[PDB]
Amino acid sequence: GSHMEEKHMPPPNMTTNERRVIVPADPTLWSTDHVRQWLEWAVKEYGLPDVNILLFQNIDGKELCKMTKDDFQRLTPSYNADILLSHLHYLRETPLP
């Protein structure tokens, strides 16, 4: 029973994405797919080999805005956790209002 697969993908969110990933400058409202979007695109921009990105597929911004350096280290440890999070926390330094 697999129907309307594209419905599981939330519509593009904020225009606060600037010219970046179509995601709010507050990694809180990055939707389930939009987290995986950057997260995928993140390994892509930052050269992250040790990253199990397909583990965050069920994590959206509300859950990643939560994530601490420890939480990434159980899915994607060492330097990769720090890369991702150090990007996320700076992104929300200028959040969507």
Curated annotation (Swiss-Prot):
Top-level division of the source organism's lineage: Eukaryota
Disulfide feature: none
Cellular localization per UniProt: Nucleus; Cytoplasm
Membrane spanning stretches: none
Domain PNT: 9-95
Similarity remark: Belongs to the ETS family.
Disease implicated: Ewing sarcoma: A highly malignant, metastatic, primitive small round cell tumor of bone and soft tissue that affects children and adolescents. It belongs to the Ewing sarcoma family of tumors, a group of morphologically heterogeneous neoplasms that share the same cytogenetic features. They are considered neural tumors derived from cells of the neural crest. Ewing sarcoma represents the less differentiated form of the tumors.
Function: Transcriptional regulator. May participate in transcriptional regulation through the recruitment of SETDB1 histone methyltransferase and subsequent modification of local chromatin structure.
Subunit structure: Identified in a IGF2BP1-dependent mRNP granule complex containing untranslated mRNAs. Interacts with SETDB1.
Entry protein name: Transcriptional regulator ERG
Protein encoded by which gene: ERG
Residues of the full protein shown: 108 to 201 of 479
